[PDB]
Amino acid sequence: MIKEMIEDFISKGGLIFTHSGRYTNTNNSCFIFNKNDIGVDTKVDMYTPKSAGIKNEEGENLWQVLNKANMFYRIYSGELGEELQYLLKSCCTAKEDVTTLPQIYFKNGEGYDILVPIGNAHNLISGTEYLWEHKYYNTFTQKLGGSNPQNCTHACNKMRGGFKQFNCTPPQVE
Amino acid sequence: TKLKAPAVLAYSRKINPTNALMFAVNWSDRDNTTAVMVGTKTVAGTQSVRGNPNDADKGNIQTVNFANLPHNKNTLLVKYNVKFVGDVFKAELGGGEYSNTLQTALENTDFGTLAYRYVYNIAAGRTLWRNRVGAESIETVITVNDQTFTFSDLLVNEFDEDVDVAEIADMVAGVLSGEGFVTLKVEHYMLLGEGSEVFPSQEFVENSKLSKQLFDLNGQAAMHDQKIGNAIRTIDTWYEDATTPIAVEPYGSVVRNGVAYRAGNKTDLFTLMDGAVNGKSLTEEDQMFVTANLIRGGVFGG
Amino acid sequence: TKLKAPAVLAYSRKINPTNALMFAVNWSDRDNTTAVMVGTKTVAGTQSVRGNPNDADKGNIQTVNFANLPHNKNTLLVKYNVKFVGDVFKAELGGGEYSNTLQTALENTDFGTLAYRYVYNIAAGRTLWRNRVGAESIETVITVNDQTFTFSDLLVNEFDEDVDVAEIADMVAGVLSGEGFVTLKVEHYMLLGEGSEVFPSQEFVENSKLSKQLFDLNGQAAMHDQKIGNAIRTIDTWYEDATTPIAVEPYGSVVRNGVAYRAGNKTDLFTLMDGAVNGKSLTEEDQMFVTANLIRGGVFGG
Amino acid sequence: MRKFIIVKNVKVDGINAKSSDITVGMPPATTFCGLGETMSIKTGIVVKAVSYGSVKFEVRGSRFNTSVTKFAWQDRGNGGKANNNSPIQPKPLADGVFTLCFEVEWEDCAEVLVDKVTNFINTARIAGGTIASFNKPFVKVAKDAEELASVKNAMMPCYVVVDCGVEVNIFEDAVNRKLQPMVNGYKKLEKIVDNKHMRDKFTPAYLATPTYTMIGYKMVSNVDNFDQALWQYGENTKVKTIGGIY
DNA sequence: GGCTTTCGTCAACCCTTTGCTTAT
């Protein structure tokens, strides 16, 4: 029922995004969809308030059926019709909340440019899946959201085992 | 004029403590500084969990980190630095017609009393916490720049007037009110006993091997720098029905005791700050509290 | 209706032994202390397991850690210090309107008898466990501050009345019922015999080659501080159908026997603690039990 | 002529290890480049290139879980919630010892540079840390290519990172090439229109995400060059080494 | 007319367990 769960999504709230600051601070609610990085293995993300939604009577909500087997690229190209295309594209919009968000200066070469780094959704879910399935073990684990992972995103709500971060420890002398 | 707050008003940490470093020395010869080794101890006890009485005939096996003095040395040496920076009324995020008018509303606090209760917690030894209990003698050596200060017996609860805490307090207050750094190389000695247990900061982790993980730097025991900072800012005796000093927080809260002493009674940091910017007559204590939080810092979202 | 325990609540340890170091001396020359070193013994045994009767003609080779007195020394010296820390009802975690209405509840508890059973368990020598069996005569010395008390032969399970244990009991219960600390540097002499088998606490080892790994700091035979502290708090003679003193666990738990003596009979720590908070008075031997657990410490709320 | 001022054994105490949402550990080259540019703003000495290192570094925590820093209740209108604990957002901390090298055009004496640096390092934080004790700064020069490498050898007991280049992405090049990522820059997604709640108001504001490069921690005396270990800003907001990919 | 407290809603994992380099 991937047409029903879209009118669901949009009604509850619905913000598909491939970049957010909810992975940094859960008090954030800033969501941007980048048009230029959607690739064949790009894992897209979504958010509704309290991560609300209905399943597909097989146990999976919108997020896992949209992450499974490039279904987001399938709809985004238009292989499942143009009536799902405009719904998915009107789902992906913009949101701006620099609150709770790190703000650093970066040079433009002849001046400065105040820059807010937010997390990547494809990088997080794709890194968890790949560094679990090729068994990379020099790494960390971070559960985003705390004891209620339905707050941050939908990826948070589903992957409650914890997102994987690279262990960036350098060598120590002596 | 309703000088309403910015979205996030962010102040830097003006006390800048470092991690304490736990060493084992003797009381007489305080020069063979050997590191306090964090060890790995596996225990056998019993379950003893609330409402689980049908598992109480079983045991629990818990691997814990332990840090003890070696049984040739009888004094725990705690070494950290405390860097009092003063740029107190300068904001990282925000600041204009809210931080400047707070600066010209907080310009007449007793910075000497704030620096006094700041230095006293480093001098009475509140940075040791459970290292301070059971010690026969807690002699602390504070080395401000080319000026060695020593303290050996201070009541940690009551800020009794000393003549050498106040001398450090003058230069720390002059830096806090003005600019610069008056960094406190601080040396703690506790006559605990031969082979007594020392108590480093425990890491809030999710360790599968260990049930209690102690903070270790290279393997040597250590205490957290924010733990030391929480000890230094434990100055607040200006809340309702004050008994003991607590850490200055935006709501005067300790999450360990499960009670907030400065919330729900219009005495929180944001209410007093809002009164200060729109124009009120703050008393000396709740003005000292607001500038103590400004030295503490923190994002003031809302 | 009822005042409940906080979900975060814990008490700190108020009897803090050091890890005992176990030395070899003579009975008459007690100041020639050599170190009982833990060595490794590989033993040829016989396979005798309750399930397998077919592999019973084979014999297992298990390497174990041993500890013996040297053959020129006939007395095991067990040296440790016991730190009795005060502020018993001052909870480390929590402490809002449940650790304070229980301090006033256990305000008339018999701290003197609790301290007598503690220092009696250090003075009869129950903190030696298996080290006492087959000893011709025991002699423990407890050197409390600028004093020295010697107890040769005391009954173990019977808390008999003698005046020097009462003196150390009074000066400990002037700390347990109040504030501060008191330390007991305890030395345990057992005339075991020349070359006799010495029993340390053996470590918990998982997937190790040794079938028995004894505790050691730098090679010396040693007993765990928790093993001493368990035997100090073996004071509970107030459980249902009491015949022997057990350790004051919250459920009266003995993991050796595999039964909890205070679970199910509504005489555990949590039901009596909730009753003491919610109005209901306790027996003197039950008040002793709950404040003995507060001396012991633990997560007392969930 | 290259004037390399090297500070050693900088015990930074409280480094927030979250360099990105997938990288936790050593602070990136953007951190040290920002520190050099902070020294350029605060004092005035124009640093065009910066190196760093690792005498010691431990991210505090377990093997796969960092230490969760407890959060103070710091938010307006959150006073009824302050009796319980506070929700904690991911912020790992790390405590390590750094060596650092700067490339500064000072064209002046060397005993006044050291101090236009010691009066900054005492008031600066290396990625949110607290600089406990650092060895005395010493200025060294480089005339030829081997004089420079008498400086690489001078910031010793340490592991300077070298840019090793991203092949296809970071996850493919971490398990095939035994290597680790690091934020080497940021990519501008959108433009922030609400400058009322920003750091400066006037500087143009962009939303961004990290872009990563992979790095290798070669001991500095085992590195053939040192221009391959001297990080500097680039064009499309990308910090890079002058010697490029190792 | 916001506004600030408190209670009511909405959930559901699969985990792994040292080297990164390795000194002028």
UniProtKB/TrEMBL annotation, chain A:
<protein>
    <submittedName>
        <fullName>Uncharacterized protein</fullName>
    </submittedName>
</protein>
UniProtKB/TrEMBL annotation, chains B, C:
<protein>
    <submittedName>
        <fullName>Uncharacterized protein</fullName>
    </submittedName>
</protein>
From TrEMBL, chain D:
<protein>
    <submittedName>
        <fullName>Uncharacterized protein</fullName>
    </submittedName>
</protein>
